[PDB]
Design a protein around this ligand. Structure first.
Ligand SMILES: *[C@@H]1O[C@H](CO)[C@@H](O[C@@H]2O[C@H](CO)[C@@H](O)[C@H](O)[C@H]2NC(C)=O)[C@H](O)[C@H]1NC(C)=O
Ligand SMILES: [Ca+2]
Ligand SMILES: [Ca+2]
Ligand SMILES: [Ca+2]
Length: 226
């Protein structure tokens, strides 16, 4: 009961202490379901394929406070596989291909006001504009170059990723979604983002993220990540 409304970080669970006070202990891997399929497995950064995020996160939890735990991160969903190397040319296109991908992902994702449900008004307006522009690209005699149409998609993506935990930085684990097969040149994600980790704290901060995609510091709005 004391735990029914008590929530714990990823890889943890609430258990009552001696005083009956709820407390978050690392989850029991045995209390993790068996995957329905191989696709539900995940790959850590040291090329070790855990059986599910539950298994991974619970494992990483015991290692909390440890060096090994500090460096342990989810690389990508699905079992481990051969990942080709990111050639230097690939790494140069990555930000370019990525930001267009993000814009497009945003256009088909948020198409109607029903899609724009969890978006603030400021954001709703940004996608409206994105849509106004896209329609124009589908009919203007001579297409124009529009970097502005990248600002929101780029901010959006950051907020989407900044979840575990929502702190304003993206960890190797949080970038896992960007290592999926759908992403263009996903194999360049780690190399690229490392390139973005300016102060080298192993976290990509909003300015680091934005900067890496070519968003002017003037156009870095945190509201767009709300
Ligand atoms: C990471 O682990 C996976 C699984 O152990 C490795 O993938 C296999 O790699 C060899 C060739 O590199 C193939 O014969 C297997 O069929 C592979 N396929 C996959 C889908 O697992 C992978 O090579 C490991 N290491 C690296 C650096 O990728
Ligand atoms: Ca985070
Ligand atoms: Ca791909
Ligand atoms: Ca950093």
């Amino acid at each position: 009961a004391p735990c029914q409304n008590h929530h714990c970080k990823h890889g943890k669970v609430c258990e009552l202490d001696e005083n009956n006070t709820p407390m978050c202990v690392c989850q029991d891997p045995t209390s993790c379901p068996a995957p329905i399929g191989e696709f539900e497995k995940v790959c850590s950064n040291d090329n070790k394929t855990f059986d599910s995020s539950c298994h991974f996160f619970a494992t990483k939890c015991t290692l909390e406070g440890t060096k090994k735990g500090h460096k342990l991160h989810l690389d990508y969903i699905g079992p481990c596989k051969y990942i080709p190397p990111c050639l230097d040319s690939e790494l140069t296109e990555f930000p370019l291909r990525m930001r267009d991908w993000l814009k497009n992902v945003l256009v088909t994702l948020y198409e109607r006001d029903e899609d724009n449900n969890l978006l603030t008004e400021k954001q709703k307006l940004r996608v409206k504009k994105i849509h106004e522009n896209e329609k124009r690209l589908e009919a203007g005699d001579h297409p124009e170059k529009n970097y502005n149409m990248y600002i929101f998609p780029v901010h959006w993506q950051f907020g989407q990723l900044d979840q575990h935990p929502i702190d304003g930085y993206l960890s190797h684990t949080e970038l896992a979604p960007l290592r999926a097969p759908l992403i263009p040149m996903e194999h360049c994600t780690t190399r690229f983002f490392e390139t973005c980790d300016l102060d080298n704290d192993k976290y990509i901060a909003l300015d680091e993220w934005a900067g890496c995609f070519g968003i002017k510091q003037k156009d870095i709005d945190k509201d767009l990540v709300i």
